[PDB]
C-alpha cells in the first residue's frame, strides 16, 4: 500500500509487508521471521535506536502468534518521531522467533516476558526463562485457549 | 519497656535449624555477663558504690573486651550466613573501638593518678566545676564519647 | 492496676444482656470474657453489623448466598441458627453460651431489645454486646435501651 | 553451625522478605570479597495477571483495577487506561477535564517521588526525613480524598469522557496552599544530598550507565534523563495539554545515583510550577466560582459549553472499544508508562498489553552492579524507582 | 448446536492431541468434564466458555464441547 | 533447595523429618495433614487422607519433582479433605484460636 | 449428614479457674502481650504504603506499642499487607513458621481476606491469606486507611485479651506425618544465580 | 609537607561543626507540636466524598442488575423471581461480600434509582471472614458518624482547613473549608 | 406522624462541621439519628446526622 519507511528504507533487498496504519498514526510492517535480525538491523543502521513495547498477542485462539516491536527514532527533543511497529506472526504448532536482543537489548526481559505468556521461543538471547509465573510451571497464561488448573490456592474462598 | 519485657519471657525458642544449642545461649550470656560485672566501678557518691577496686576503669575495660565473643558466638552458633557475616562484622566493629577507649580513660587515669573511680572523681571534686577533667581534656572526652558509641 | 474478681459473672447471670463500656483503645475488656469463660462459658465473639436481621441470623435459618465473582451462580447457602446450633453443639453440662458482640454501635435500639428479650427467654444465652464509650470498663443491663 | 569457609564467591539472596520498602524481588548477588561479579534478579512475585484479567474487562469496571501497577502515583496507570479507548474511539475531552487531569498527575509524580525519596535516602544513610516526607505525601493523600473519593490508588476519577468528578469547593485554595508549603522543601531535599559530602561520595559514579546505552537497554524517565537524554513525553508527544505551561525538562550528564536523584529532585520543582500554571489558567477558575457562574448566568454565556465541563458525554458502561490498534503513553514517576491495546469492537479489549516504567529500568540492574561494593546495591535499586507491582503486574 | 448461554463440558479425547493443548497441562483438571462451563461468546469454530471455577476462562474450539 | 507445598491442611516436604528438621530427599515425600488444627481427625478420616495422598502420590509417578507437581498433589488433597469436611466426617475444631471457616462455613444439607 | 460442614462437639473442657492470684497473672500475661505486639516488617504490594502511613508521624503506629520488626523471629504479630501470588505464598508461609508461638495474623485488604479484586480472573493470585495462615483479624477496604488498620489492631487486642494462659496447647501443630516413597524424576536448580557470568550473555 | 595534615584536620572540624548544626536542628524539632491523629480519641473525619462502607435501600431497588454488570468482579449478589401477579421484578436478599469489595462505588454511579450510596464508614475489621457478607439489612443501617462519639475530637485532615491551615490540630471552634460558596457570588455579582 | 419523614429534601444548619449548607436527601430514619444522602458529586454519599442539626426547605 504505503508506508514512509516501507518506500523508504525497505527497498534494500529486504521484502516486508504493509499492514496499514494504526489510530495513532503507527505504519505497521508485518515481518517474516526468517529475515527479522535481518530488517530490524536496516532499522537500527537508520535511526529507530529505542524499542519500546516488545509486545506479543495471540489474533486469534487457533490462529497465528505475533510477536510485535513497537521501534522509534528517540532523539534529544520533541515534536513527534517516525516511530514503526513491526510484527512477526509465528505458527502456533512451532513459535520460534530470532531474538533482537543483539540489537536492542531492552528485549532482554521483554522476551522473557512474552516467552512466559505466550510461549514464543527466542533464539539468541541469553536467558529463556519464565520472568512471571514460577520458573517451573507448565502452561502459557496470555493465551486464550489457556486451561488454568485448580490449584486449592486459586479457588474461591469458601 | 516493662511490657516489652514480659512478653519476651513468654515467647517461644526457635534454634535455627542447626543451631549448636549451648554456644546459642551462651552468646547472650557471654555479651552481657561482663556489661553487668562492670557496675561495680560506678560511684554514685564517695562510697555509694559496690567496691572501690583500684584497678577500677581497666577492670571496665577488660571487661567490656569480652563482647566480641559473645557477638562471634552468637555469629557462630545458627546455621545461616548473614549472622556469622553479621557476627564477625560486629566482632570487627567492637575491636576498632577498644583502643581508643583505652587511651582516653588513660589521659585520665594520668591525671588521676590512678585507676579507682572514687580517686577519679575526688581529683575533679575540689573546685566543683572548674577541676572536672572536659575542661582539661578536651579532645580526650570527644574521643571516649564516640569511642563509647 | 484494677485487680477484678468474678462479679462480672454475677452482673452477667443476673441481667442476662449487659451492654458493656470499654476504652476504644483495645483490649481492656477481654479480661472479663476470660473471667466469664473460666467459670465455663463458651464465649462466642463475633461482630454485629456483619449481623443482619437478629431474629433470622441467631435463631432461624438464614440463607447466606455468598459471592460468586461472575463464575458461579447465586448458590444459596442455608447456615443454620447460631445460637441454637452452637447450644446444641455444647457439652450438655456447660454453663451456657454467650454472644460477645464487639459493636455495639452502629446498632438500633429494637435490636437491644430484642437481644436482652431473647436472652430472657431461652434458658442459657448471654449478650455481652459491647456498645463502647467509656473511659473505664463499666457495664449496665440492657433494661432501658 | 554448618556454614564452611570457602575461596570461593560466595551468594547473598536478599529475597523477597524485604525488610525495608523495596517490594518483592529476589537479588541474588554473588559478590566475591566486595565486588558484585553476578547478580540475578527473580521477578514475579506479585504478577496478579492484569493482563489476562483486562481481556474479561470492561474499561469502566478495569478503571479500578488500574492503581495496582504503579502504586504510589495510581493515577497515571488511569491516565492510560482511560487515554487508550480515548484514542481508538477519537472521543475528546473538555480543556477543564484536561487541566484537571494535568494537576492531579503532577500531584502523582510530586507523591510518587516523594515515595521514592523516602526509601533512597533511608537506604542511603540519611534515615532522619524519612518520618517528615510521609507528611507532605499526606497533604497529598488530603488533596486526593477530597476530589478523587480515595487517597493515592483507589481512584475512579479518569473516564472515557473526562474526569468523574470536579474539585471540591476548596480545592484550589488548599492545593496554592501546599505548593506555597511545597516550595522550599525540595531545595531542603537537594541541600540534605548535595551540600553533604558523605552522601554525594555515596552516590558519585556509583551506576555508570551511558547515554547510548540507557538507549539501547530501553530506559526511560529519570533513568534516562540523568544520562543526558531530554525525553520527556509531556513534551514529545504533544499530551494533554501539557504545552500551554512554561516548564523545562531537567537532565544530567553522567548517569549516576546523584544524577537520578537530581533530576528527581528537579521534576519535583517542575511539576509544582505546572501545577501552580494550571490553577491559574483553569477554565473557570476554581469550582464554586465556575458553579457560581453557571448558576446566576442562566443556562447559557459559555460557561455551560464543553471545554468548561468536567466530563465530555459520561458514557453508558457497555461502550464498545472499537475495532483497531495503537499504543498509548504516559510519563509517569518513572517514564514510559504505555498501553498496546489491540480492541476488536467488543465490550472488552482483545489484547491490553502493559509496557512498565519501571520493568525496563529493573533489567539495566545486573549491569548496574557490574563494579559495584555490596553496600551499593541498594543505592543502585534505590536509585531506580523501582514499584513491584508494575514490575510484576 | 451450541449456542450462547449453553452449559458444555469438554470432551477429553479431542482435546488430547490438539493445538489447545499446547497452551496447557496435559494433566487437565475435572471442572471441564462437568456439565457447567457456560458458553459467553462465539466467534467462529471457537468458544468462549466460562468455568465456575474464579479463574479466567478458556477459548476453545467447538468440536471441543457437547452440551450437557 | 527443599522441594515443598507449603499451604493450609497439608504441607508436602519433598524429603524426610529427622528431628525438627526436614532434609531434602529425592525419592520419597513427608505429608503434615492439618499442622494449626482447624479440623478434628478422627482416625477413619486420616486413614482416608493417608490412603488418597499414597494414590496421589502414585499416580503422579513419571512427572518431574518440581514444586509445580508438588504444589498439585496438595491441592488435589486440599480438595479430598474439603470434600470430607463437606460429607460430614470431619469437623471443625472450636478449640482453636482462629475459628475462620477457611472451607466454607457449616451450612445445613438442603434447606 | 444434615449439616454440611459441621463443628464437632469438644470434650467438656474447662479450666475452672476459682483463683484470683492466677487470674491477675493471665491479666499481666494478656497485658503485656497485649501491649508490645511487634509487626514483622512485610510488605509485598499496595497495602503497605498503608501500612507505612501507620509507621509515620500522621497516624502513630508505636503508641499502641508496636515497632515493626526485621526479622520474624521477634516479630509478634503479621499484618499481610497486600497480595499474596503463588510464588509469594510457600515465602510468606515459611515467614509466618518462622515466628514464635504467640503469633497473630491481620488479613489487610480485600487481597488478603478473599484476593479481592484478583478473585475472578487471575491465575496466580492466592484467594485470601487463611487458604495459607489461621488469621486472627480479617480488615476490608482495598487500601484500607490507617485508622481502619489501627481498627483492627484494636479487635485484635481485644482477641489477646481473651487467651487464657492455661490454654496454650493450641499453640501446637500436631503432626501427622504419613511418609510415602515417590517415582518422580528430580530435575535441576534452573535459578542459580548465573546471570552475567552464564556463557550466553557474551556472544549470539 | 603538611598540606595533607592540615586538610585532615580540616575535613574533622568540618564534619564536628555539621554534627553540631544538626544536633541543634533536631533538637528544634521537639519543641514543634506533634502531628499524631491520635485515632481512637482522634478519629480522622473523612471527606465528602471518602467511598466507605456501601449502604443498600431494599425498598428503592428496581432488581436489575447494572450494580453487577458495572462492578469490577461482579460482586452483588442480586437474586430476583418474576411474580407474574404484578409483573414487576421483586427482588429478594440483596448483599455485597465485603472482603471482597474493593470500594470503588462503581456500583453507586450506575445505579438508576439511588439505591447504592456509599458511607463514612470503615471500621470494619472483624474476626470471622464470612460475617463480611452484608446482607440487605446488615448494610441498610446507619453508618458510624465519626463527629456524634462522645470519645472522639474529630480533626478535618487538609481539605477543610480555612485557606492557611495546614494541620487541623490547632483548629479553635469548628472554621469552615475554605471560603465562600456558590450561594455567595450570585449574591456578589 | 408530624415528625421528620423520610423521602424529602434538607439542608444542613450545625454551623461548626464538614458538611454545611449542604443539601440533601433524607433516606432512612432509626431511632433519631437521620442519615441523609447527597447528590452532590459523582458518588452519592450518605452522611449521618441527628434532628437538633437539621431543617427542611420551603423552596424545593
Ligand atoms: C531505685 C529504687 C530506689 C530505692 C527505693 C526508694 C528509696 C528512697 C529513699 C532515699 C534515701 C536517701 C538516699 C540517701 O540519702 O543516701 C544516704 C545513704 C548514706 O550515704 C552517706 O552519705 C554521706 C555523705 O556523702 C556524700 O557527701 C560527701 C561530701 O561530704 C560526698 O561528696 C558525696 O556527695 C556523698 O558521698 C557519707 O559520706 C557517705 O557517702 C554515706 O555514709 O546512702 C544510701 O543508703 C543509699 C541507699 C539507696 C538510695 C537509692 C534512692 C536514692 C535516689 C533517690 C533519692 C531522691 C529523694 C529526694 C527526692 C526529692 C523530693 C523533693
Ligand atoms: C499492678 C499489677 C496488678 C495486676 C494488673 C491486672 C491487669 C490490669 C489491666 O488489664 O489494665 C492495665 C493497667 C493500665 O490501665 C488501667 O486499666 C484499669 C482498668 S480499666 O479500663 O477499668 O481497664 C483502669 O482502672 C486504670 O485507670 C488504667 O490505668 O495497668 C497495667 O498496666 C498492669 C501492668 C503493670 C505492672 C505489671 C508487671
Ligand atoms: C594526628 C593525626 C594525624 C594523621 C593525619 C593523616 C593524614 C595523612 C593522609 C591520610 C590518607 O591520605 O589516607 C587516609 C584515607 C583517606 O585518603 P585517601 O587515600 O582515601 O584519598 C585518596 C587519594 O587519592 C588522595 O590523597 O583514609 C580515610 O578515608 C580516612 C581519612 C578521611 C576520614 C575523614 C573523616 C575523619 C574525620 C571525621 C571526624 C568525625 C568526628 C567528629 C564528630 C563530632
Ligand atoms: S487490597 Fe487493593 S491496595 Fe491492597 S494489595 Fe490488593 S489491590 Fe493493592
Ligand atoms: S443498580 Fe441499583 S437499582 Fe439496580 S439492582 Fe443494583 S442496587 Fe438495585
Ligand atoms: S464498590 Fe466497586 S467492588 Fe464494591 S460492589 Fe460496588 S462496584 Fe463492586
Given at each position: ?30 515481518v517474516?521471521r526468517?529475515?527479522l535480525?535481518?530488517?530490524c ?10 524499542l519500546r513495547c516488545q509486545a506479543a498477542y495471540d489474533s486469534?485462539?487457533?490462529?497465528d502468534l505475533v510477536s510485535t516491536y513497537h ?14 511497529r513491526i510484527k512477526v506472526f509465528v505458527p502456533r504448532?512451532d513459535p520460534r522467533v530470532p531474538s533482537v536482543y543483539?540489537?536492542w537489548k531492552t528485549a532482554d526481559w521483554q522476551e522473557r516476558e512474552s516467552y512466559d505468556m505466550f510461549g514464543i521461543v527466542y533464539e539468541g538471547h541469553p536467558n529463556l526463562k519464565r520472568i512471571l509465573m514460577?520458573?517451573?510451571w507448565?502452561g502459557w497464561p496470555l493465551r486464550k485457549?489457556y ?12 | ?149 | ?145 | ?42 521477578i514475579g512475585?506479585?504478577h496478579?495477571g492484569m493482563e489476562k484479567?483486562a481481556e ?162 530501553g ?108 499504543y ?10 504505555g498501553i498496546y491495546?489491540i ?8 489484547r491490553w498489553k502493559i509496557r512498565p516504567?519501571?520493568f525496563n529500568?529493573?533489567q ?27 514490575v510484576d503486574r | ?21 499446547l497452551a ?45 | ?111 | ?204 | ?189 | ?60
Open positions: 500500500e504505503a508506508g514512509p519507511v516501507g518506500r523508504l528504507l525497505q527497498s534494500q533487498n529486504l521484502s516486508v509487508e504493509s499492514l496499514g496504519r494504526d489510530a495513532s498514526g503507527v505504519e505497521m510492517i508485518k517474516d526468517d529475515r535480525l535481518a530488517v538491523q536496516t532499522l537500527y543502521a537508520d535511526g529507530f535506536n529505542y486469534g485462539p487457533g490462529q521501534l522509534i527514532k528517540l532523539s534529544d527533543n520533541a515534536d513527534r518521531p517516525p516511530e514503526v504448532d543483539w540489537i514460577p520458573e517451573d507448565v485457549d486451561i488454568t488448573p485448580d490449584f486449592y490456592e486459586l479457588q474461591e474462598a469458601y | 519497656p516493662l511490657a516489652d519485657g514480659l512478653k519476651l519471657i513468654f515467647k517461644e525458642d526457635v534454634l535455627p535449624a542447626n543451631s549448636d544449642r549451648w554456644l546459642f545461649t551462651l552468646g547472650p550470656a557471654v555479651v552481657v555477663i561482663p556489661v553487668f560485672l562492670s557496675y561495680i566501678i560506678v560511684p554514685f557518691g564517695q562510697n555509694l558504690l559496690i567496691s572501690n577496686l583500684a584497678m577500677g576503669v581497666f577492670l571496665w575495660i577488660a571487661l567490656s573486651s569480652i563482647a566480641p565473643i559473645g557477638l562471634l558466638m552468637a555469629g557462630y552458633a545458627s546455621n545461616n550466613k548473614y549472622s556469622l557475616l553479621g557476627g564477625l562484622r560486629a566482632a570487627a566493629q567492637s575491636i576498632s573501638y577498644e583502643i581508643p577507649l583505652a587511651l582516653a580513660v588513660l589521659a585520665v587515669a594520668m591525671m588521676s593518678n590512678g585507676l579507682g573511680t572514687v580517686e577519679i572523681v575526688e581529683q575533679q571534686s575540689q573546685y566543683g566545676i572548674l577541676s572536672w577533667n572536659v575542661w582539661r581534656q578536651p579532645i580526650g572526652f570527644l574521643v571516649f564519647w564516640i569511642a563509647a558509641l | 492496676g484494677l485487680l477484678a474478681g468474678y462479679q462480672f459473672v454475677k452482673d452477667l447471670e443476673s441481667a442476662g444482656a449487659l451492654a458493656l463500656f470499654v476504652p476504644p483503645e483495645g483490649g481492656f475488656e477481654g479480661r472479663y470474657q476470660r473471667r466469664l469463660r473460666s467459670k465455663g462459658y463458651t464465649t462466642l465473639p463475633m461482630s454485629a453489623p456483619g449481623l443482619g436481621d437478629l431474629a433470622a441470623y441467631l435463631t432461624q435459618e438464614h440463607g447466606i448466598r455468598p459471592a460468586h465473582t461472575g463464575k458461579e451462580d447465586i448458590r444459596v447457602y442455608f447456615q443454620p441458627p447460631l445460637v441454637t446450633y452452637h447450644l446444641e453443639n455444647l457439652p450438655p453440662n456447660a454453663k451456657g453460651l454467650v454472644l460477645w458482640l464487639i459493636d455495639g454501635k452502629r446498632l438500633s435500639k429494637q435490636e437491644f431489645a430484642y437481644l436482652a428479650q431473647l436472652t430472657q427467654t431461652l434458658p442459657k444465652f448471654k449478650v455481652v454486646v459491647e456498645v463502647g464509650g467509656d473511659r473505664v470498663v463499666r457495664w449496665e443491663p440492657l433494661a432501658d435501651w | 553451625p554448618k556454614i564452611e569457609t570457602r575461596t570461593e564467591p560466595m551468594v547473598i539472596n536478599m529475597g523477597p522478605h524485604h525488610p525495608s520498602m523495596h517490594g518483592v524481588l529476589r537479588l541474588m548477588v554473588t559478590l566475591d570479597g566486595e565486588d558484585v561479579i553476578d547478580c540475578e534478579p527473580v512475585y506479585l496478579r484479567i474479561n474487562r470492561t474499561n469502566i469496571m478495569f478503571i479500578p483495577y488500574v492503581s495496582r501497577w504503579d502504586y504510589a502515583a495510581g493515577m497515571f496507570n488511569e491516565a492510560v487506561t482511560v487515554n487508550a479507548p480515548e484514542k481508538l474511539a477519537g472521543i475528546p475531552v473538555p480543556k477543564r477535564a484536561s487541566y484537571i487531569r494535568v494537576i492531579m498527575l503532577e500531584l502523582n509524580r510530586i507523591a510518587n517521588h516523594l515515595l521514592w525519596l523516602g526509601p533512597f535516602l533511608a537506604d542511603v544513610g540519611a534515615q532522619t526525613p524519612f518520618f517528615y516526607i510521609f507528611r507532605e505525601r499526606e497533604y497529598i493523600y488530603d488533596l486526593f480524598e477530597a476530589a478523587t473519593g480515595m487517597r493515592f490508588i483507589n481512584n475512579n476519577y479518569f473516564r472515557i469522557g473526562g474526569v468523574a468528578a470536579d474539585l471540591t469547593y476548596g480545592w484550589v485554595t488548599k492545593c496554592r496552599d501546599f505548593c506555597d508549603y511545597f516550595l522550599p522543601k525540595v531545595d531542603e531535599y537537594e541541600r540534605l544530598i548535595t551540600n553533604n559530602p558523605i552522601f554525594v561520595r555515596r552516590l558519585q559514579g556509583v551506576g555508570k550507565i551511558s547515554r547510548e546505552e540507557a538507549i539501547n537497554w530506559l526511560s524517565g529519570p533513568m534516562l534523563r540523568a544520562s543526558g537524554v531530554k525525553w520527556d513525553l509531556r513534551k514529545v508527544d504533544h499530551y494533554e495539554c501539557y504545552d500551554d505551561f512554561d516548564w523545562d525538562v531537567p537532565v544530567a550528564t553522567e548517569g549516576d545515583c546523584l544524577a537520578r536523584y537530581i533530576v528527581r529532585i528537579q521534576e519535583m520543582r517542575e511539576s509544582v510550577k505546572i501545577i501552580r500554571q494550571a490553577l491559574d489558567g483553569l477554565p473557570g477558575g476554581p469550582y464554586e466560582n465556575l458553579e457560581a457562574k453557571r448558576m446566576l448566568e442562566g443556562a447559557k454565556s459559555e460557561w455551560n459549553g464543553f471545554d468548561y465541563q468536567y466530563i465530555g458525554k459520561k458514557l453508558s458502561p457497555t461502550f464498545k472499544i472499537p475495532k483497531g490498534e495503537h498509548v503513553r504516559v510519563e509517569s514517576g518513572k517514564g514510559e508508562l491495546l480492541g476488536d469492537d467488543n465490550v472488552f479489549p482483545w516504567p519501571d529500568n529493573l539495566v540492574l545486573p549491569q548496574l552492579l557490574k563494579g559495584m561494593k555490596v553496600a551499593d546495591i541498594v543505592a543502585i535499586l534505590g536509585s531506580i524507582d523501582v514499584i513491584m507491582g508494575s | 448446536a451450541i449456542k450462547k448461554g449453553d452449559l458444555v463440558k469438554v470432551v477429553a479425547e479431542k482435546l488430547a492431541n490438539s493445538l489447545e493443548a496447557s497441562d496435559h494433566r487437565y483438571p475435572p471442572y471441564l468434564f462437568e456439565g457447567r462451563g457456560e458458553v459467553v461468546d462465539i466467534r467462529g469454530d471457537y468458544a468462549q466458555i466460562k468455568f465456575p471455577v474464579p479463574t479466567p476462562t478458556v477459548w476453545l474450539r467447538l468440536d471441543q464441547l457437547e452440551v450437557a | 533447595m527443599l522441594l515443598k507445598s507449603t499451604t493450609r491442611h497439608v504441607h508436602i516436604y519433598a524429603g524426610h523429618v529427622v528431628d525438627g528438621e526436614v532434609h531434602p530427599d529425592t525419592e520419597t515425600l513427608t505429608l503434615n495433614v492439618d499442622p494449626d488444627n482447624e479440623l478434628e481427625w478422627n482416625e477413619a478420616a486420616l486413614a482416608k487422607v493417608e490412603a488418597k495422598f499414597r494414590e496421589l502420590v502414585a499416580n503422579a509417578a513419571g512427572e518431574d519433582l518440581t514444586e509445580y507437581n508438588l504444589r498439585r498433589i496438595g491441592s488435589d488433597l486440599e480438595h479430598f479433605i474439603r470434600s470430607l469436611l463437606m460429607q460430614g466426617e470431619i469437623g471443625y475444631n472450636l478449640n482453636s484460636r482462629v475459628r475462620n471457616y477457611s472451607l466454607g462455613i457449616p451450612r445445613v444439607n438442603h434447606s | 449428614p444434615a449439616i454440611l460442614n459441621p463443628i464437632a462437639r469438644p470434650e467438656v473442657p474447662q479450666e475452672l479457674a476459682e483463683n484470683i492470684i492466677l487470674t491477675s497473672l493471665n491479666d499481666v500475661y494478656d497485658w503485656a502481650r497485649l501491649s508490645s505486639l511487634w509487626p514483622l516488617m512485610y510488605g509485598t504490594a499496595c497495602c503497605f504504603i498503608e501500612f507505612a502511613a501507620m509507621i509515620g508521624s500522621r497516624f502513630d503506629f508505636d503508641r499502641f506499642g508496636l515497632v515493626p520488626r526485621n526479622s520474624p523471629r521477634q516479630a509478634d504479630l503479621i499484618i499481610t499487607s497486600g497480595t499474596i501470588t503463588m510464588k509469594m505464598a510457600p515465602a510468606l508461609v515459611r515467614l509466618y513458621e518462622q515466628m514464635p508461638s504467640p503469633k497473630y495474623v491481620i488479613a489487610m485488604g480485600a487481597c488478603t481476606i478473599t484476593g479481592g479484586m484478583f478473585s475472578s480472573d487471575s491465575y496466580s493470585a492466592v484467594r485470601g491469606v487463611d487458604k495459607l495462615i489461621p488469621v486472627d483479624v480479617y480488615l476490608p477496604g482495598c487500601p484500607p486507611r490507617p485508622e481502619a488498620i489501627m481498627d483492627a489492631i484494636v479487635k485484635l487486642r481485644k482477641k489477646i485479651a481473651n487467651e487464657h494462659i492455661n490454654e496454650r496447647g493450641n499453640l501446637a501443630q500436631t503432626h501427622r506425618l504419613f511418609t510415602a516413597k515417590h517415582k518422580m524424576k528430580p530435575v535441576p536448580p534452573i535459578l542459580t544465580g548465573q546471570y552475567l557470568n552464564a556463557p550466553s550473555r557474551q556472544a549470539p | 609537607f603538611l598540606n595533607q595534615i592540615t586538610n585532615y584536620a580540616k575535613e574533622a572540624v568540618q564534619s564536628a561543626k555539621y554534627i553540631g548544626q544538626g544536633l541543634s536542628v533536631t533538637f528544634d524539632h521537639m519543641r514543634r507540636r506533634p502531628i499524631t491523629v491520635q485515632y481512637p480519641y482522634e478519629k480522622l473525619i473523612p471527606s465528602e466524598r471518602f467511598r466507605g462502607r456501601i449502604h443498600f435501600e431494599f425498598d428503592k431497588c428496581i432488581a436489575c442488575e447494572v450494580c453487577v454488570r458495572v462492578c469490577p468482579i461482579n460482586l452483588p449478589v442480586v437474586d430476583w423471581v418474576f411474580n407474574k401477579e404484578l409483573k414487576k421484578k421483586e427482588l429478594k436478599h440483596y448483599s455485597i461480600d465485603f472482603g471482597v469489595c474493593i470500594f470503588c462505588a462503581n456500583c453507586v454511579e450506575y445505579c438508576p434509582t439511588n439505591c447504592l450510596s456509599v458511607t463514612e464508614e470503615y471500621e470494619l475489621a472483624t474476626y470471622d471472614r464470612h460475617e463480611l457478607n452484608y446482607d440487605s439489612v446488615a448494610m441498610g443501617r446507619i453508618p458510624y458518624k465519626v463527629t456524634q462519639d462522645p470519645m472522639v475530637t474529630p480533626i478535618r485532615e487538609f481539605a477543610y482547613l480555612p485557606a492557611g491551615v495546614m494541620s487541623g490540630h490547632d483548629l479553635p471552634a469548628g472554621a469552615q473549608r475554605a471560603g465562600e460558596r456558590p450561594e455567595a457570588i450570585a449574591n456578589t455579582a | 406522624i408530624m415528625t421528620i419523614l423520610p423521602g424529602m429534601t434538607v439542608k444542613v444548619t450545625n454551623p461548626n462541621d464538614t458538611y454545611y449548607q449542604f443539601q440533601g436527601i433524607v433516606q432512612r430514619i432509626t431511632d433519631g439519628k437521620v442519615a441523609v444522602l447527597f447528590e452532590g458529586g459523582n458518588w452519592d454519599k450518605l452522611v449521618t446526622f441527628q434532628a437538633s442539626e437539621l431543617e427542611p426547605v420551603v423552596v424545593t
